[model samples]
Target: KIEEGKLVIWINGDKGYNGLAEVGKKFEKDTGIKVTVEHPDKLEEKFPQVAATGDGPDIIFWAHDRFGGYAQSGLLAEITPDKAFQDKLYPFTWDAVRYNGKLIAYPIAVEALSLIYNKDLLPNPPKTWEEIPALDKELKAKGKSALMFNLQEPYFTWPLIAADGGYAFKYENGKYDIKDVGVDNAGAKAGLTFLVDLIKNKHMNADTDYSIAEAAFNKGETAMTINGPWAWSNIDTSKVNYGVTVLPTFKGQPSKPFVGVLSAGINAASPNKELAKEFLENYLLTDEGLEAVNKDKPLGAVALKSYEEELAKDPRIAATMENAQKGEIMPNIPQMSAFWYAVRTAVINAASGRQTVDAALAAAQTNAAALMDPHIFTSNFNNGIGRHKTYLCYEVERLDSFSLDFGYLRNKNGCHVELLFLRYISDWDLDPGRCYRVTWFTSWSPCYDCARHVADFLRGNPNLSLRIFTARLYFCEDRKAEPEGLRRLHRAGVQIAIMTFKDYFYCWNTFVENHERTFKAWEGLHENSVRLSRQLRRILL
Candidate 1:
């Protein structure tokens, strides 16, 4: 027997949930059908597990990107909202839930990235990525940061890369061709290089996650940031006056953020399918229901054109609507899950110089490819995830008193400080009259234990001098544990500094026993300058 009198929905405290809750209560009074709502932490991850056993809700509210996975698994019930429901939505919103001409979910709102700036510090939103340097310099002088964004996140990264002609997969023949991935191309590397430049120049920090970025903007610590309207609630409106605009052009091209649409889908196993469909269409999709939802959290852009007139007055939705038109619809395919994780990992690795842009992309492609077509690659990687682990190796060179020429740069030992211990034996073991000089460069920040080891190695060998350089910290490497080592290095009288272009030039001039090969800045020297300078700085304490 069909449970014609009941409906259930899953949520994660979304704005629409509160709105839907009110509509459901009203529906029960009007039609005698009881409706219940459940909040689950990781809906997408946990949905399959719950749905498989037939313990799923009648309706599920989510971003449309995962619909394909559900649809692929035969978990979604194909739904067609009323014709007006189909016609009233914005043009782009449909793409989010429309897969293979099938409407798997009904979209509610449009979401994409937009440029937000502090009116006091930045007079206007930047017109191009090139201006960030000047903006950063000015902002830094004013005790502010130019940009605040999660640089390592794919959600933020794709639009940036897309602006410069990079893509997760090419849309072709009215379908996404998995084999035509563009993440490993020359254009992708160019995009990665530009982002790396931002971090190296101190224009943006490498460790800012979504919460930290929003909190910083909320506190007026940053002049501008790229974020969506969902972040508006967390920002303290009283502390800062902010303006919103579309993302700045990258090399004169507009950015295409990944457009997301929040939607409602039906579970295949739900016995109350009719009740679910009727409730979703008549209650959730109506203008009254939308008003209730918008009251809780204003949708950046409503899917329905019916309210396009009223939404114009909404400050949060105004500018973001323009961005949505230019944005790429986040693909609702199973392969996208892999692509999302892969792009972020590759960008972060390349941005840190922990892996070359080319190497990182290749690694990501290998891992993502396996996910897209699992049987082909088999199980070469642990659990079949080649990129599950992020690892990198860097070199430090030690000068040997005995050898006439000491230009060998070797891998980091077990610990970050192990090189110093080895250098003591290889080069400066016999001496009191001679001081030890070493050039240390790393792809990762030393953790507390490693930093302590480095500090101890230096203090015990008073005659030894160390210059530490690094591309980026591993998010200060666990925040708490790494600080002690940095403190130790500071107390042990060692020089520490980040690399710069000048040191890269100096190394070219003075690094080797010979006068060195002719220096070519375009021979890929510009990108490495920051890392090399950080490694070779003269900041021994």
Candidate 2:
């Protein structure tokens, strides 16, 4: 059945997918199997949804950094590439694909950030950061800046931040320790300060995004930017006289860009596991197969060792490869999501003057801690199986006083979350003429008993508007009484929703004990929330 079935693949970007589509055609023709190459919009956001329900493609091609999250979420299947196959690729490439000592993807290509500069502007790239000001002064006369890049992106900023000593987490004993977040350390601060200074001094615009930066650099509006091999096409298409060189040093410290690898992995839920493995090992990993894919997309630094000589002939590829030698492999752990969120926010806040550099970083440290510590409530916790604890994060608005407040609390012993909140809140001497709004972001939806209590409370307090967004449904199956309870709450004018990414984000910043850290969505977060939401709609109906 597997042999007769068609293999489906989901890849991001048309150019990347086109390359794989060509390879898929060859695989189909040779093996008498059909192949489908799909260009999925928002592949990262949607893949987790499909993976959770076993409704996605048989194979997925993406950056290897996501392998850790996918492997942790049980979305990727482990593949045992033979010794010869393993030996065929650079040894360091495996670091991005292996999680918990298991290879989850077949490495395809590798890249690193490099200093891409306009050859016409400098003729030779500067070796140090201090040299940029003189270039900026000259460019200012032309209505341009000396340096520009996506200032909001942590990936672009990480090279500078990490070069000093900043890192996402401590990797020791072949595992990343989530507790040891270093994004706000002294070294990281130095790097981040440099970026903030650029914005503050007007060397770069705070509003510059990837598109703006790329377009400006390509137009020769900016003399230099830091980007990876994937950006080469944009420069080439614009006909910019560009050169790739190692990143300029900052105060004698060399910048260490993050090394990245691209790979394809089989879905753990796919029925065609054996066929998928065969396709990868026999076709995708082979020289002919990779060449077909590269021909379409111009994959830089192909992982297959056979292409080294061919790729090295291009000075652009060699420059990026040279930088890769000094680059740090991006951490593949799930906590990296938190790192991106925190660092990005810190940079933006500092650049915009919403906070000072020290304050922004300290807030980031706090916020990152909040994000990494998933459990909102931990003090005096009850751990018995039947007695599950409930955490509630809330926002309140009182029209009478024109006041707003937000906070989080956990259920006490013997009192469920709903009843506890009800008892605490009903004591308020709310004026009937005054309007009040309360929103709750709870770990679990109300149980049948609590639902009854909450509905009754709402009847007596017409001035209070209540909304509940739950992370998980509590026994909301058709046969269970929880369905009827939810209906009752809905009928009582209670707006209920499954907590989506935005809700989690709002709660993290507003109510959770986040030290101003940003909230990042976890693997399968949206998919699971959406599933629960659909389930909830049916139950309410």
Candidate 3:
């Protein structure tokens, strides 16, 4: 028995919340811990005020991202686990609590988005964006709607756009750049175009009310729908046999859905920080504790090692875990709210036929860029100087490695230039007539690639040492296997940066280790990549 005292917990109103409350009561009965679970509608507004006044609850059930804002505002306590405790939990789960080098949250549950289809209605879901239209046509021919989608909800619609290759923002340096947003990026427009074509051709129905869509799917009137694991319990499994699978892709990339996790963190201002930490550890880390929570509502646990077998046993949960492995976690950053609102407006405009895919996307990009401009200026102003106005030159080992030409840097009006070839390094004469300040290099052999590109540029450039930078490249390794790419970049040159990895593992690892403390801190980087890849095809051309 740790301590016999009343422990208050603020919970959400969803099924998951009820499930957690059941477990809380069990803990209270087994131990002398008096637990009070409160479900408040305005937790976002209420919790902060309570914490500020030192009157918040001991524990809270909330999204990993929501915990982020609280943690940053100094309202959340840093939950530091001993090496033994950390070693027992999943590495990714441990990563979730880490924010700004501090562990501030404990991950309890994880849910992923995926495509769920009635097996009897459609034997196979569309595998790619191109296939959706054809599937819609086939369904229409049979006097049925092929697909139903959420157009008004940005959370639901953005992933579809991403499937075609569009994004709401571009992350560079330590901040995000929003010069490109929406269908303006070829992939986003491609996705939007596909949806519009389906709507125009009467293959897919976007105007269906939310309740109608759910009812239609339940009645076996619709062939397929895209949603998260939360819908599983409400699904009428008895009425029709349904199957869950990965979202269709565009090009070679998978149509990945966003993953959100329920994470718990101690309130920094709470007097019971130690007790809250103990509560989280006892409830979330133990196999028995985890099983109890899963039994309450079976969305897979973040602690994979302890709950893998149990999760695999549940059919719905098993499918969700499989899909989650391929999904991207929503980035938890304060800027994300702005990002979501801007993207939502753009997606709504495109979906309603009010703007061309490109026009809608461009507007989104413009809006996001304006919102991000203030942060961008601070970044540029900080790194704009090299040593005391000395004209510095940098070199790329091979200019051909990059798609852009390097001749512009050599001209009189261009910045100072340098070229590196094996043992030889040459610097071009500085044209005094031209106001050359900084020099940027492209490729630098084994010394620089992927995450190292921006760092190498910063190190080599003496005059035009701008604080902000952005680079894109294709790497062969699966991102899930190694999410340290961006971590390496943060250690190198840029104070804030984002990179897209090829696999989800890397992204998951990065999120677990760094994002757990502040959910939205990494949101712009990860979510933007997902959105871009989904909407890629439309923008590429």
Candidate 4:
């Protein structure tokens, strides 16, 4: 039912939410429609759940990448912009809000990844990929990292691969051919080979995640990194002497990154769709509306072409747009979910020397193809910050039915993976008389809150047996209660251990769509597991 005289908005981020609230005050004054703005935890997962029941926010603000999925599921209302409104915004922004030839949202801002360098250290950034290795040697001797970023994340490494004609999907004649996957092409192979060499030469560690790179750069111990505008808030506060510029060419060919657009849309289920549409077009899309939002949270490089001159005055914004002009617009198609998982797996395998560059991409190509097909798909990962997300691959055996099922998932928005797993399997209706076995291979051990939830769940399902093999312990030292949580799980009859080489091998074959390739161990695999295991033993006792 419609909450008469009120409109609700569901958005993420505190600064942006605060800014939207300010704008809502004016909208309320003009239309007499009270506005409520909310920053929901686990919004991505929860939105779908609520929308399925025809109850949620009237409006949603998020990235364009999700527009395709939402519109396809009938969760977003179609928006038709008049010519006057259309002419005021950049033409590229329209590409983000349209799905199946219908406009489903309005773009607010645009961003793309650029090379950020310590101006004092490099003086001038490198001109090509070849020049970086020499700088790495100089920095290595000084006990500094030459370059670092989210090494295994495809978003951070796409520029290198795309520079040489590699792409996840084939876009031609204004449509992407999902049947044609370009990840295993020669260009991607060359790009990945370059990254693997950096690890072999000791220029970068395979285990350096986003946090490690950001910390090093903030401390002036790193010469360069690749990041987008979202990272500026932290970098600005760090007070590092930094410069933003287009990424250097790879072997004389230009490197192209991906462009992302943040957008706003009305929900299909909202009874106030017409009022919501009026607010979006008449208020939120205006210069005054955008300015109010920017006052509270800086919106870098807004979508309105009328504001170009003002935006160009800022050098950082200039560099970002310059790079965006030469980059590929991120494909906002449902198939992209499969692309992220496949590429991350390829990067991990190549960086750790588990497979040759070509072999790794070939495996990724197979996995991506399988994942995109409805008949063969087996994994679902949420797009979150790489540093904070936890990946879980699980295998379940129904002893009474003599059947096995395996798949993978990741934490969503701020939700832990363990709680998500419970929610996922809750409807399976496991028979209390039958014994079941479950095994989980997780990237991070359960946090205290999640461990507590899992223990309570297990208490009610005594017929189920569980085991967890984790890649790393989660906040055991910093959060004292984390160790106690592990003990509680142990007392609940759950088996826990650090993932070993054999575990990785088994998961790759059972859960991953590997093309009969062997899983090679990463460097220090046994050593790291032994260390984590000892820590776990200390906690268990």
* Model 1 / residue 69 / CA error / Å: 1.4
Lowest summed lDDT across 10 adjacent residues in model 2 is found at 378-387
- Indicate the residue-level lDDT of 340 in model 1: 75
lDDT of each: 0.67, 0.76, 0.55, 0.78
Q: Give me the overall lDDT of model 4.
A: 0.78
- Model 3 stretches astray by more than 4 angstroms: 1-5, 41-57, 140-143, 167-184, 204-212, 236-239, 313-318, 369-541
- The TM-score of predicted model 4 comes to 0.65
Candidate 3: worst-modelled 10 consecutive residues by lDDT: 402-411
Q: How close is every model to the real structure, measured as TM-score? A: 0.65, 0.69, 0.61, 0.65
Tell me the TM-score of model 1. 0.65
Per-prediction count of colliding residue pairs? 13, 3, 43, 0
Candidate 1 segments whose C-alpha is farther than 4 A from its true place? 1-5, 13-16, 32-34, 236-239, 313-315, 371-541
Per-residue lDDT over 39-152 for candidate 4, one digit per residue giving the tens place of the 0 to 100 score: 787675577678867888898887777677666556777788898999889898987887655788989888788899999788799978887889999888988878989885
lDDT of 2 by residue, 1-541 (tens): 1223779888777245676777788888888788888877878668877887777888888777776667756777778878878888888887678765578898888878889988887788889877787779888998777888888777888888888888877777665656577877999889888878877777877888888888889888888998877778767889999998889877688887777787888887788888888888788777887777766655678888887667779888888888877767888765565566777898888888889888888877666543324454322111112236678876666654333334567777777878867754653333456688988888778889999988999998888889998877778766888889989999999999887777766665555565444665666677787777888888777
> What's the lDDT for candidate 1?
0.67
lDDT (Cα) of model 2:
0.76
Best by TM-score: 2
User: Which 10 successive residues of model 1 have the least lDDT summed?
Assistant: 375-384
> What's the distance in Å from true for residue 418, model 4?
34
Model 1 over residues 1-541: C-alpha lDDT tens digits?
2244588788766444676688888888889888887778777778877786676788888878878777756678889766766777776677778764478888888877889898888878788888888988977887888888887578887777787788877886566666577887777777777888888877777777877888888888888888876666555444578888878888778888888888889988888888888887787677887877776666677777777677878776778978877777877876777677788788888777788777887777656643212221121111113322222222223243321111223234443334434543443232355555655543344566767677777777787676655434443433465645665776787566654445434443333222224543343345455543443332222
181-208 per-residue lDDT for model 3 (tens digits): 3436778777777767766776655566
Better TM-score candidate (1, 3): 1
The list of candidate 4 runs beyond 4 A from truth reads 1-7, 12-17, 28-42, 295-298, 370-541
